[PDB]
Amino acid sequence: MTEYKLVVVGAGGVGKSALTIQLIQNHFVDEYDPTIEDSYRKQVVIDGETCLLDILDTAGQEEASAMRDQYMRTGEGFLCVFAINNTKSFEDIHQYREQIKRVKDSDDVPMVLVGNKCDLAARTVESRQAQDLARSYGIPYIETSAKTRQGVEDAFYTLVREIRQH
Amino acid sequence: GMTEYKLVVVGAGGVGKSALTIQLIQNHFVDEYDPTIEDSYRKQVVIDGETCLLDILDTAGQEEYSAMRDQYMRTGEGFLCVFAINNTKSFEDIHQYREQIKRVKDSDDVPMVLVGNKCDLAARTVESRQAQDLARSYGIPYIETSAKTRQGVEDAFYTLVREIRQH
Amino acid sequence: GQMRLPSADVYRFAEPDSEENIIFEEGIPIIKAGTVIKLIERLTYHMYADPNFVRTFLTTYRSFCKPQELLSLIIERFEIPEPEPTEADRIAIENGDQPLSAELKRFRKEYIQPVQLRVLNVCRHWVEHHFYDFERDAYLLQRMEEFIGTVRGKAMKKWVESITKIIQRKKIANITFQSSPPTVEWHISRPGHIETFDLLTLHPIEIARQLTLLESDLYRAVQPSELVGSVWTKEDKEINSPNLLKMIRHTTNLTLWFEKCIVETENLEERVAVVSRIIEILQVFQELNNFNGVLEVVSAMNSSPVYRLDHTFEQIPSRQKKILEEAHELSEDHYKKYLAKLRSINPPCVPFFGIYLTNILKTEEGNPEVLKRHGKELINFSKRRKVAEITGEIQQYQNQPYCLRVESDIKRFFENLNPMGNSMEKEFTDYLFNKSLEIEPRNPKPLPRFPKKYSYPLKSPGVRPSNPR
Ligand SMILES: Nc1nc2c(ncn2[C@@H]2O[C@H](COP(=O)(O)OP(=O)(O)NP(=O)(O)O)[C@@H](O)[C@H]2O)c(=O)[nH]1
Ligand SMILES: NCCc1cc(S(N)(=O)=O)ccc1Oc1ccc(F)c(Cl)c1
Ligand SMILES: [Mg+2]
Ligand code: NA
């Protein structure tokens, strides 16, 4: 069993915890309880190989913004999450991308761009704009709903494949 | 190569039974243990000049899985029947453990030893004469052990191996 | 340079590390042993978060610190003094200017705010995942509510208000799949006809599915509080470990029911059909990764009353002999193949709990509570980490739910199964063994013949599922 250290990052309220708990427990969390730092483990077979995912669920609130280096050092791959109905969270993505690159001192960190809350009709970030950003980073873009499970396994397991091929 | 003996520890739960095998298999001189470690229950020993390998099954903690006892017991060539010297109920349980071993092995003469274990400083309630009398009525050896000082531990296992060799 | 710290005389968590208060194992450090003060410092360390350490500590701390004392210590940890103005600040103030307060601002940003946030994360995890401390001590809960409810200042405000709400919700306290569960399967017994339910009349696929849902729910209900301190082995086990004991007693009852179904079927041909059906149920348990169920069957087949039934074994189809033998091989050599299989499958699964119990008990019994170093007694934290590694593995397999539909009547049938009746254990297991001797006497006694007892077809419907439109 190979172990993979995944880290979920992004602005406050975009659904990082809801995405993670949907993956881990098949349950959608309605409450908005801001995270400080949580960790989860999941044994899962991906492309025929069993592995153990360690998932770090991080704080999006700006009051925690000085505490990120410590978890970026340990992570092997990063889900970079914004919400498709919150333009500011999309604009916050590049700050996370740049900090990860600085901390890991690398241009080539496994990442996936995730546009969450795709169950909501009132979209303000168009898929094309997010896809353009993902291409500029060399990473895939996956739209997800923590509420319906759409795309959730695809987002996390695509990140595992990126770490595996790194 | 060398003979391997499959030994099974049986007895009441909650009264320090597991200290017997832990103290045997342990780094005798560092009080430490990881039971998850492959072969934390296998030990090469020399008994009366003859080297052998002990494989010890001690399912301590699983006593409530009472319908699994037969399956666990059938794996064994020799049995340590353990009670705590400050727990009379565990001593009274011995008769039924012995009967169950005899049934599972389908033999009236199964290698076994009776072990009285001192697991704390609480007052002894089973006198050694009582346990000696019970062991003699069964035709088996009696060994007393301490759960803290390792006294008697080697004697308990080595005596059982001698019962197997002389069966 | 490093930030200066408060004097250790006014703030105890600023004492320097030494081998008299903390020992590390041989990229965050792993703690082998330490004083409770040093453990709490590292639990809430300013340089890094350690969520695994938070879980380990909150799972195991009661073996070395009382809940009331833990709360006092983390409140003490939270109340960090701010440094006085520096010489440059003093000179600015003496000239009527605003000081830069560079050292103060750095200490707030890089020491106080991370430590305080990590104290609140301990509180949040304590309330969310270890709430039993507060259920059992109402005054502890009052103290926690007051502490959280009186934290001032904007930096912590979002988490303080959140934790207040979480506590209130915990005081008064839904699964989604993308695929549909398979259709419930029926055999001789039809829906609603609970009086006809039995081993051979329910569908073997559905027996295995409903037992798996039941056993999964029992597995998922066991909390670490039932395990730490080996409390399920002690005199108060019924008080402290009720979900674990309910789970084990279900397993025992099902094993005994299988044995009873076999030995009370006196006709040889019918008994072969009974054993064959039980091995089919075992095959479905294997397909569902219900290892508890697999071992329930294996334990029944290796029991003294069943194992000796050589005439029955002889007539079991070779492919079924092989299924049973390979299932038994999982348990050989101290569960070597079981452990490898558990770590390779795709959950959901139902682990066998007994191995975890033995490993927790032996870790607790085989390691000292304290390490003595330089005349000091340090808490042996490595021992607690080992226990929490086991409880963490247990919890990891409790997350994934089965995509199977409950059948309420079949569920009730298996919940109410009571093969022993009003008999005590010894009386009942002697009865089973005496039935075994009756139906297949010891050689050289001849094998008797017995009349059939089942009026319905014995042919199995098999264990491959069906799918109408
Ligand atoms: N409709 C919808 N709501 C969602 C989705 N994901 C999360 N939410 C909602 O958005 C809110 C915030 O979710 P949460 O997972 O706490 O976000 P977060 O990114 O972890 N916040 P923080 O950074 O503070 O920890 C919650 O009310 C949650 O139910 C989604 O996919 N769809
Ligand atoms: N000759 C021993 C064969 C045997 C092996 C196993 S084991 N160790 O492979 O699990 C379990 C039980 C068992 O005895 C049986 C008795 C009656 C039966 F109908 C059947 Cl099927 C098996
Ligand atoms: Mg969150
Ligand atoms: Na007593």
mmCIF file of C-alpha atoms and ligand atoms in Angstrom, chain B residues 86-88 125, ligand 4:
data_model
loop_
_atom_site.group_PDB
_atom_site.id
_atom_site.type_symbol
_atom_site.label_atom_id
_atom_site.label_comp_id
_atom_site.label_asym_id
_atom_site.label_seq_id
_atom_site.Cartn_x
_atom_site.Cartn_y
_atom_site.Cartn_z
ATOM 1 C CA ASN B 86 -6.260 -13.217 43.402
ATOM 2 C CA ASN B 87 -9.345 -14.208 41.356
ATOM 3 C CA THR B 88 -11.111 -17.348 42.563
ATOM 4 C CA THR B 125 -7.361 -15.751 47.271
HETATM 5 NA NA NA D 4 -11.249 -13.853 44.320
#
